[PDB]
Design a protein around this ligand. Structure first.
Ligand SMILES: OCc1cccc2c1OCCO2
Length: 147
């Protein structure tokens, strides 16, 4: 019926149907639209105390909990979706990945090079699409597929 990994859901607060993708954790009101050797993605990483390496250019010792990291991620997604902030701007300022210096761009990559949840979300995103919170051993990601 729907592209890879989409399902119908129902808003608890409005009662209006929406669509959820269980690979990217994206959610939207519209019915989803419509695989390549490679995709190009940017990301914004929020690390937490259980991250593989709980350290970053922003903080020598990352101590926030994983729940706290998810709330930060959720807040960034809200401002990106409202257009109050750009993905690139928030990634430059707040991504715990040193790709913050490149507005979060990771360049292009094939299957097998990234952590599997990141890879699966990246390849399930349509070009221009953004993920919801994506969990890996690094932390929690917002992923933007640029190519
Ligand atoms: O293009 C990606 C990139 C750009 C700049 C810095 C980076 C980085 O990847 C992770 C390591 O730090």
């Amino acid at each position: 019926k729907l592209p890879p990994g989409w399902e119908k859901a129902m808003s608890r607060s409005s009662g209006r149907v929406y669509y959820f993708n269980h690979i990217t954790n994206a959610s939207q009101w519209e019915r989803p639209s419509g695989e390549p050797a490679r995709v190009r993605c940017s990301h914004l990483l929020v690390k937490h105390s259980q991250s593989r390496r709980p350290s970053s250019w922003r903080q020598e010792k990352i101590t926030r909990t994983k729940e706290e990291a998810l709330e930060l991620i959720n807040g960034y997604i809200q401002k990106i979706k409202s257009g109050e902030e750009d993905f690139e701007s928030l990634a430059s300022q707040f991504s715990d990945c040193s790709s913050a210096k490149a507005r979060g761009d990771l360049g292009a990559f094939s299957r097998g090079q990234m952590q599997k949840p990141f890879e699966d979300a990246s390849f399930a995103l349509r070009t221009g699409e953004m993920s919801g919170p994506v969990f890996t051993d690094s932390g929690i990601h917002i992923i933007l597929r640029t190519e």
